[PDB]
Amino acid sequence: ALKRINRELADLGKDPPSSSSAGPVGDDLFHWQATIMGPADSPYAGGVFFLSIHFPTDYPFKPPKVNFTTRIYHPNINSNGSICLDILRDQWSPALTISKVLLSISSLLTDPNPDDPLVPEIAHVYKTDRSRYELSAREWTRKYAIG
Amino acid sequence: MQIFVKTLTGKTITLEVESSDTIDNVKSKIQDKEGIPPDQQRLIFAGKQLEDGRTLSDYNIQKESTLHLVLRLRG
Amino acid sequence: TIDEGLYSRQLYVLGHEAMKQMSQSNVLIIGCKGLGVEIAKNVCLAGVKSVTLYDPQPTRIEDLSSQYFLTEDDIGVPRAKVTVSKLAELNQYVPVSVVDELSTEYLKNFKCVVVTETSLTKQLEINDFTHKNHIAYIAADSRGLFGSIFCDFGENFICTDTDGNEPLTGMIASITDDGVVTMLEETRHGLENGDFVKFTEVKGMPGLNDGTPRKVEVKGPYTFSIGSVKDLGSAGYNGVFTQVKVPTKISFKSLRESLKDPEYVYPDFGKMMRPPQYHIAFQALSAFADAHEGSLPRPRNDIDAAEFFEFCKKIASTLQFDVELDEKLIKEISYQARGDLVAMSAFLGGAVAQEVLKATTSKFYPLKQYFYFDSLESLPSSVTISEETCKPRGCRYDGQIAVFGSEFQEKIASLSTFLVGAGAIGCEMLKNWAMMGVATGESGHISVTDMDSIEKSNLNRQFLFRPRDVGKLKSECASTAVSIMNPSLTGKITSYQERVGPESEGIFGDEFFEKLSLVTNALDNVEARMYVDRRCVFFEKPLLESGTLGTKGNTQVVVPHLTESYGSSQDPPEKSFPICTLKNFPNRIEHTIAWARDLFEGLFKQPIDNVNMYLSSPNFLETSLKTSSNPREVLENIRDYLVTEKPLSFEECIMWARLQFDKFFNNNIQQLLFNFPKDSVTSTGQPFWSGPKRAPTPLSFDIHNREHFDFIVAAASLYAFNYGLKSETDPAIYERVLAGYNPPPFAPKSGIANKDKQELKSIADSLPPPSSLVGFRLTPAEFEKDDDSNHHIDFITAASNLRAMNYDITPADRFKTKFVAGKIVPAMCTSTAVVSGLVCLELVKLVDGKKKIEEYKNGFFNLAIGLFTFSDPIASPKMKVNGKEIDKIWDRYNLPDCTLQELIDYFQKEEGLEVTMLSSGVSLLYANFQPPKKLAERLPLKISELVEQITKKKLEPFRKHLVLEICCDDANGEDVEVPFICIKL
Numbered sequence A: 001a002l003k004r005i006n007r008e009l010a011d012l013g014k015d016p017p018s019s020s021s022a023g024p025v026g027d028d029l030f031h032w033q034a035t036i037m038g039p040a041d042s043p044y045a046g047g048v049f050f051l052s053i054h055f056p057t058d059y060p061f062k063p064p065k066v067n068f069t070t071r072i073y074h075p076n077i078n079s080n081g082s083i084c085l086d087i088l089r090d091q092w093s094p095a096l097t098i099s100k101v102l103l104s105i106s107s108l109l110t111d112p113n114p115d116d117p118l119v120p121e122i123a124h125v126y127k128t129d130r131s132r133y134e135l136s137a138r139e140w141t142r143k144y145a146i147g
Numbered sequence B: 001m002q003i004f005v006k007t008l009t010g011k012t013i014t015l016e017v018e019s020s021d022t023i024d025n026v027k028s029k030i031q032d033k034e035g036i037p038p039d040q041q042r043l044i045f046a047g048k049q050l051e052d053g054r055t056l057s058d059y060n061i062q063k064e065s066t067l068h069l070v071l072r073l074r075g
Numbered sequence C: 001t002i003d004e005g006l007y008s009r010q011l012y013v014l015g016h017e018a019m020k021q022m023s024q025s026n027v028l029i030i031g032c033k034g035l036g037v038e039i040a041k042n043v044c045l046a047g048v049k050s051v052t053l054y055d056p057q058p059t060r061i062e063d064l065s066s067q068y069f070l071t072e073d074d075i076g077v078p079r080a081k082v083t084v085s086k087l088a089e090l091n092q093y094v095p096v097s098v099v100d101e102l103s104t105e106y107l108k109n110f111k112c113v114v115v116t117e118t119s120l121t122k123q124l125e126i127n128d129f130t131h132k133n134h135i136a137y138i139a140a141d142s143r144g145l146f147g148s149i150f151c152d153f154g155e156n157f158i159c160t161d162t163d164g165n166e167p168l169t170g171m172i173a174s175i176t177d178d179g180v181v182t183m184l185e186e187t188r189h190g191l192e193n194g195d196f197v198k199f200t201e202v203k204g205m206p207g208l209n210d211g212t213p214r215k216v217e218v219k220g221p222y223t224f225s226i227g228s229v230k231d232l233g234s235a236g237y238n239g240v241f242t243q244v245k246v247p248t249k250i251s252f253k254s255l256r257e258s259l260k261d262p263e264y265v266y267p268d269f270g271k272m273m274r275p276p277q278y279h280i281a282f283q284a285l286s287a288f289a290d291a292h293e294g295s296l297p298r299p300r301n302d303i304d305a306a307e308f309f310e311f312c313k314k315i316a317s318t319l320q321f322d323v324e325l326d327e328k329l330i331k332e333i334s335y336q337a338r339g340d341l342v343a344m345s346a347f348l349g350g351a352v353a354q355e356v357l358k359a360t361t362s363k364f365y366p367l368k369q370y371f372y373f374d375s376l377e378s379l380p381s382s383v384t385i386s387e388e389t390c391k392p393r394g395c396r397y398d399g400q401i402a403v404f405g406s407e408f409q410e411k412i413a414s415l416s417t418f419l420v421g422a423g424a425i426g427c428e429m430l431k432n433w434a435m436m437g438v439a440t441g442e443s444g445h446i447s448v449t450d451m452d453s454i455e456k457s458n459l460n461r462q463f464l465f466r467p468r469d470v471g472k473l474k475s476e477c478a479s480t481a482v483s484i485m486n487p488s489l490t491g492k493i494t495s496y497q498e499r500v501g502p503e504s505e506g507i508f509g510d511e512f513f514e515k516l517s518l519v520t521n522a523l524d525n526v527e528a529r530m531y532v533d534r535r536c537v538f539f540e541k542p543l544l545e546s547g548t549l550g551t552k553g554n555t556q557v558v559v560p561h562l563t564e565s566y567g568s569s570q571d572p573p574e575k576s577f578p579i580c581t582l583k584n585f586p587n588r589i590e591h592t593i594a595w596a597r598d599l600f601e602g603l604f605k606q607p608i609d610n611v612n613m614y615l616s617s618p619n620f621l622e623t624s625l626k627t628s629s630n631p632r633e634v635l636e637n638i639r640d641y642l643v644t645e646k647p648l649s650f651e652e653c654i655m656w657a658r659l660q661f662d663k664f665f666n667n668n669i670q671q672l673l674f675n676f677p678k679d680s681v682t683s684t685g686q687p688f689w690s691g692p693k694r695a696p697t698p699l700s701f702d703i704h705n706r707e708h709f710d711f712i713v714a715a716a717s718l719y720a721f722n723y724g725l726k727s728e729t730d731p732a733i734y735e736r737v738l739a740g741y742n743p744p745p746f747a748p749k750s751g752i753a754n755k756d757k758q759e760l761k762s763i764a765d766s767l768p769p770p771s772s773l774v775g776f777r778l779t780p781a782e783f784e785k786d787d788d789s790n791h792h793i794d795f796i797t798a799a800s801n802l803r804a805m806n807y808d809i810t811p812a813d814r815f816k817t818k819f820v821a822g823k824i825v826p827a828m829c830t831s832t833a834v835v836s837g838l839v840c841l842e843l844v845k846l847v848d849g850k851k852k853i854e855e856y857k858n859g860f861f862n863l864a865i866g867l868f869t870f871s872d873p874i875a876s877p878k879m880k881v882n883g884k885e886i887d888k889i890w891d892r893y894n895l896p897d898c899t900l901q902e903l904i905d906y907f908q909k910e911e912g913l914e915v916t917m918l919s920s921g922v923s924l925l926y927a928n929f930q931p932p933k934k935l936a937e938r939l940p941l942k943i944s945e946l947v948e949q950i951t952k953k954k955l956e957p958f959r960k961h962l963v964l965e966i967c968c969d970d971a972n973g974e975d976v977e978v979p980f981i982c983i984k985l
């Protein structure tokens, strides 16, 4: 619990995550506000996405509840920020750090998985009209994830 | 030798392999033919699930054996 | 005709058919002492057709040692006559009678016969008849810390279910030509060799859909084999398999035949040579009683012990038993012959009642046949146990003084316990404490806390409550009932209506906890258990945890400085389904039930809360516009529920229900099939709707269909309740209103700046001002599973079944829907009795202050298979700190309320450790990586002032200590764990 959360906070403190940046909200160790930078080789290039993490008591057992705050046009992310991620579902298995999660999420943002989508309309647009999906993603990441 | 891999939809794929070939090589061939990542390939023969790091001979796979390929759906 | 309002929790363990067959069985009980009354109580609560009692022996004072339906005013009256009146009140569906005399032929009137406190010759006489006429015969005996059970259900007993587990079912991936069946990815079937399975919905091999069971040959954790299916087909794909359970035939032996060659059941594998000893010992006890006018050996008497040992030798010689008699154990059985402990009686009563239910219902695997148990580890060793101390004193505690002595009775009488919860386990624990005389001395006291109220379904396993008590507080009723049982507990019991948690530390503070002697948990959630465990660890008090689940149960003991705490162990967590599965692609009824519950909450609960908050908070709109994740959704909900779709009558509610039916069961499915047509393929070329994904089909509203009508009625009723209108149930109005409905056109949409904020503002200003609506509120719907007139479970069932019809899932009934949606935990009275007995057997060890860890026993049991096991508690882990041995759990640092800098300097100079992180609660008080300015601002402050500043909340006047967690590094830079700090304010 508090000691694991702190070992991780110190790890991130020393080993620079570079792309990401996680830290406690105010002084509460069970509520973090993380930042993710849009991959260069993706429609979300040049974007800053804020995520809220709510560590659970059982942690490192139970999975960290992670929700997007910035609006994003992604097949696996809905309007409330929920993320369709496998690591948070049944591959969590306390063993990884809060830099693994953010790496996974950076790669999910790099390339979506439309075969098991969470937003069917966006997945349909991605599968059928790729160019329109790219334009919509760029518009959304320019309107919300910048400034 | 030659082997047959049956999919979930009833399709049969014929492969040219050797008894000494590793499971990884077979999964690579299946990815090359069908595009299925090895991590999502679950090959089963005679009620036993093929595991990475072993060879066909380890599973007593012989001439014209039949395997079954099921996908490991992600979330 | 089962009253599911009363047997709600029991039915999930037994079932409808089992209880229906059970309600037609008669049970006779011979002997009405503590064990007999316990068995009768459990049977009456279970729900058998009737119970008959036979015990013409007049009451005596010592009989009150474990008989809680006897009072000191009843001395000289037959036990059955005075016990029947009090037993008749437990359940109104189970008449209780009494018979003055027993004849052999009379036994033909009963389905089961239980015998206690009867000589061996009479038992043989009864069994010689009950065996050849196919009547279940159970014989139980309790002598001090020893117990015996014997079962005989006839030569041709038929056991339908042998383990009590639900049938195994799974989704198939492929079936080969050689019968090799395969499960889906990362799915374990759990089958065992020799099982039978039946297949359904198989494509390519229709022959396996007939339903004929087939053998199972497990070849691995993910695959098995069924044999040769060459004729039926070559290969099959997809389909669902379900295990088939076949009846078993068990043949028992009569008592006379099994005396010579018994078949034992071993409750513990550490002592496997004892049951052969007890088999001789109990027969010797019966012979001795027959040879001394039914007088058992006197407590701790050497002459009687020698005579009893001679009888044991004679019996062993007669039966050609090739076993060397252990003199010590046999003489121990002799000494405690007259003992009568409420804990042993409760344990054996639970076990025997379960056996009776097995005999009547032909379910679960019964004991076969002898079950000898002992808890001799509980015998005190720190007090004097001799003939002088164990002699009777002519009081109600003689049955216990004969085992523990007067000094241990004085030790018990001055206990100061704390019981958390007043549920089933709580009621049993209070009964045991009242019988044992706990806290009946000058310095004794008992405290019981519980914030819940009595409900109808609770009366099935909480015998301290009556139907007239429904709606009252549990703690007060329990305290009054136990005071009635033992008058000496008048004024020695305190009852609180406080929830044990962080908010109640003002009542259960340092002063309250420093006077206790032990804490006993009777809870049903992990949060409260963990909190109480942390409090006990901080205050160093013994803790007794116990839990039940259906027929399974466990009990654990936590001892300061000896064993690990409750929170040092983990249990499997609950399973929550992926959001993508629930939202769009369900394949099991659980997914549809979860979706229906979410729909209920989102339709009748959340919009009402938003509307109410808007009408109360003056600045709600501004806060929501930049706080909530979807302000547009909130504004739309407010508009729809205030102005746009505000019903003026019930007809508008019916129209709204029809519209919502179309919205959720006809239009969303059309949109989904537009996005992903049935013939679409994935990126790898495989069909999209294959395997875990089932292709849905839109539903067309048919009024004649039952499910559609149920959904319409439930939705309309809940909407009217939200708006406080007068609902109706006559189908005529529904059929009249729904006839004149024109569905608005719908065509799936393909999709294809800052003006959105302008639209949001335009919508916002269209809403009525809060001042125009004063005193107007909308009633939210708070989920309540136990009430059958609020339409909650009806709505959830209807919605779940309709969505199942969408995805071709097999619909469930209201029973399973209530079980799943309500998170109901199956419960039984027998399991509660057994766990209470085990906990009270551990309590005497705790009172005696035993030090060795091998003398305590954590217990686990499963009554569906007759499994009992006991294992020693795990010792608390040790560690090395500054070259000293430190207990990881039970050690702490005690420091004054010094400044943060002084604390760091103390840790540096004393322990030679550098403090790198210091936190309290959920706040980071100090970290080594913080900017120097912040530290320089925080360093010279006291700990209390620092905590107040960081947490932005003044310390309460009753707060007397602070618990701080500290992570520090050694001189070399290696992280070393240290115990927490207890700052004294």
Ligand SMILES: Nc1ncnc2c1ncn2[C@@H]1O[C@H](COP(=O)(O)OP(=O)(O)OP(=O)(O)O)[C@@H](O)[C@H]1O
Binding pocket: C009, C420, C421, C422, C423, C424, C425, C449, C450, C451, C452, C453, C457, C458, C474, C498, C499, C500, C501, C522, C523, C524, C525, C528, C825, C827
């Ligand atoms: N945090 C808590 N503090 C105090 N008492 C608690 C706490 N949590 C639960 N309890 C009490 O523990 C008892 C739990 O017993 P039990 O589960 O048998 O009853 P129930 O939950 O009311 O019934 P059911 O589970 O059959 O619906 C109840 O008295 C409940 O009030």
Ligand SMILES: [Mg+2]
Binding pocket: C452, C453, C455
């Ligand atoms: Mg309750």
Ligand SMILES: [Mg+2]
Binding pocket: C524, C825
């Ligand atoms: Mg409960």
